[PDB]
């Protein structure tokens, strides 16, 4: 039925597309904040406050990771899954860098830790661009959903 088409298009939008977009957006926001806290721990002088912040940053990393893993269970085939797979590769790359940064910040200090982040921009930028492309895919899905919904309501003008 034309009316069930409206309901299903709406349900896909409200219960699949929007939660995807909200989730990826929130993960990107958290990742971006987490990234700045990695630089934020470098001017720090007290080694116990450095330790603390790295622990908190690692907690956020795992949250990001858990959210990514959960989000990857919802991805649709095609460009999104492909993009998400790439993102997970760059995420693992970046968390490998991050674990090296943390190990180096905890051991040698910010002077020797800062280059890990500074020289690994291509690793982080690739991660960022995967989020951007993923957000682009979901933005496209949202607008395509809205077009579908608006289209399916044409039956009510009959
Ligand atoms: N759920 C998810 N992670 N991806 C699919 C989101 C867009 C899909 N509902 C659509 O194209 O309508």
Numbering used by the authors: 32 to 189
What does the paper say about this structure?
However, our results show that vc1313 encodes the MCP that senses d-Arg and d-Lys to initiate a repulsive chemotactic response in V. cholerae; therefore, we renamed this protein as MCPDRK for MCP sensing d-Arg (R) and d-Lys (K). MCPDRK contains a ligand binding domain (LBD) predicted to belong to the 4HB_MCP protein family (Pfam PF12729) as a sensory module, a transmembrane HAMP domain (Pfam PF00672) and a cytoplasmic MCP-signalling domain (Pfam PF00015) as output module. Overall, MCPDRK-LBD forms an antiparallel four-α-helix bundle structure (4HB). Here we reveal that d-arginine and d-lysine are chemotactic repellent signals for the cholera pathogen Vibrio cholerae. These d-amino acids are sensed by a single chemoreceptor MCPDRK co-transcribed with the racemase enzyme that synthesizes them under the control of the stress-response sigma factor RpoS.
To elucidate the molecular mechanisms of ligand recognition by MCPDRK, we purified the LBD domain of MCPDRK (20 kDa) with a Glutathione S-transferase (GST) tag that was cleaved off before the final size-exclusion chromatography (SEC) step. This purified LBD was monomeric in solution, both in the absence and presence of its d-Arg ligand, as determined by multi-angle laser light scattering (SEC-MALS). The crystals belonged to space group P1 and contained two LBD molecules, organized head-to-tail, in the asymmetric unit. As the monomers in the asymmetric unit were virtually identical and both were ligand bound, we here only show and discuss the A-chain of each structure. The final structure models correspond to residues 32–187 or 32–189 for the d-Arg and d-Lys-bound structures, respectively. In the MCPDRK-LBD structures, both d-Arg and d-Lys bind at the same site, at the bottom of the second and the third helix. To bind the ligands, Asp47 forms an ionic bond with the positively charged α-amine group of both DAAs. Further, Glu111 and Asp47 interact with the delocalized positive charge of the guanidino group from d-Arg; in a similar manner, the positively charged side-chain amine of d-Lys forms a salt bridge with Glu111. The ligands are further stabilized by hydrogen bonds with residues from all helices, namely Asn43, Thr48, Thr105, Glu111 and Asn176. Trp107, from the short loop between helix 2 and 3, forms a lid that closes off the binding site and has a stacking interaction with the ligands. Chemotaxis assays demonstrated the essentiality of 5 of the 7 MCPDRK-LBD residues tested (N43, T48, W107, E111 and N176) to promote a repulsive response to d-Arg in V. cholerae. d-Arg-mediated taxis was not affected by the N43A and T105A mutations, suggesting a less relevant role for these residues in stabilizing the d-Arg and d-Lys. MCPDRK’s d-Arg-binding pocket is located at the bottom of the second and the third helix, where only five residues are essential for recognizing this d-amino acid and similar compounds such as d-Lys.
